[PDB]
Write a protein that binds this ligand. Structure first.
Ligand SMILES: [Mg+2]
Ligand SMILES: [Mg+2]
Lengths: 181, 182
């Protein structure tokens, strides 16, 4: 299994409106557990296409898994997916623990963002950062080092703090580091 | 070149471009060390589009330095507040202080021509442009930018390295035209 092999995709929201954004598109790499978080104004197909255009600038996934929300089962999205040889796979009642982690993550994510009603847009990058750079007892590593190579030139100076200075950021990093698993 | 990934970004807008799907500019962000390039379509070369694009990019990591010219999008009170907060140092081209400046400038001309050459479809093709760029061998660093950012001995997420899994006519054309100039 490669990285960028299979994406797990879902929306959280509606959240308190931080700077005209209400939702977050949560994309999770199946192999690495690396999470990309995209703020959106609506859980639309257009918003999803915009977000995934940016993500798929890096690599085109083999499979994208989502529930059967309107944004994902629209024909526009199917067309978008077909155009680039992406196969969409949907949550059904009958086809196959990965979800258990994603559910728990999406729950923490919602708690973190709802709790910062005014600033969550601004701190969204901090949340992704802290999450992808927190250690997993199942992965033996962090999602970041799994994506960017285990022994690789790390883009961080203080692993204690991940180069976060302000107390909003630190209290956030704490909460994630502690509550994640 | 600087020490590590994310030490230094070079940032600039290209355009105006032929209005494709409501977009008119591209924010070009280049990592100093790796040469990795991120392309972000916007409707304006504005502060808010930059902050919005860079918030995505900097979810990966916070750069120590961003270098840019004195475009209004970069010199605004709002953008300065954004950087001071994220802890990023902004470094501008000045009359006193304009090697790898030629690389960036050439690349930004190439990009403008590729996108203006595809007046109504450049927006849809941007991901192809970015992907092609970061996965083409660089004579200057013996590797591809993707290799330098994601790992020399990381397994490439592509089956065929000559085509990079690309099938469409207008898309293989781009990979060809980019593989020439770079
Ligand atoms: Mg859902
Ligand atoms: Mg300029």
């Amino acid at each position: 299994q490669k990285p960028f092999d299979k994406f797990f995709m879902d929306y959280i929201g509606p959240l308190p409106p931080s700077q005209g954004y209400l939702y977050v598109l949560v994309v999770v790499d199946g192999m690495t557990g690396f999470t990309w978080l995209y703020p959106t104004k609506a859980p639309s197909t257009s918003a999803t296409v915009k977000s995934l255009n940016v993500l798929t600038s890096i690599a085109i996934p083999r499979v994208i898994h989502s529930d059967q929300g309107a944004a994902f089962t629209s024909s526009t999205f199917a067309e978008w997916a077909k155009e680039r040889g992406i196969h969409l796979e949907f949550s059904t009642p009958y086809h196959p623990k990965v979800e258990r982690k994603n559910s728990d993550m999406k729950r923490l994510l919602t708690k973190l963002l709802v709790g910062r009603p005014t600033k969550w847009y601004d701190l969204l990058p901090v949340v992704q950062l802290a999450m992808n750079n927190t250690y997993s007892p199942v992965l033996k590593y962090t999602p970041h080092q799994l994506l960017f190579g285990i022994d690789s030139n790390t883009p961080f100076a203080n692993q204690d703090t991940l180069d976060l200075t302000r107390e909003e950021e630190l209290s956030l990093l704490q909460e994630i580091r502690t509550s994640l698993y």
